[PDB]
Amino acid sequence: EQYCAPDTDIRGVDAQIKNYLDQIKMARAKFGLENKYSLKERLSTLTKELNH
């Protein structure tokens, strides 16, 4: 909504979008990188449990 505001300058709003898109990448990446990897460690623990 800031793009069509009266006193807003387009340059600043474009800069905000880049920062926002990068922040999106980082949060999703951190959660996904953990999910599988931590879960894979849990799966190795599960294979030990299956041996037990």
């Binding site: 793009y3 069509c4 807003t8 387009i10 709003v13 474009d14």
Partner: peptide, 11 residues
């Protein structure tokens, strides 16, 4: 006004 709307479309 047309300027800003064309800009938002690029975004």
């Amino acid at each position: 006004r047309i300027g800003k709307l064309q800009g938002l479309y690029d975004s």
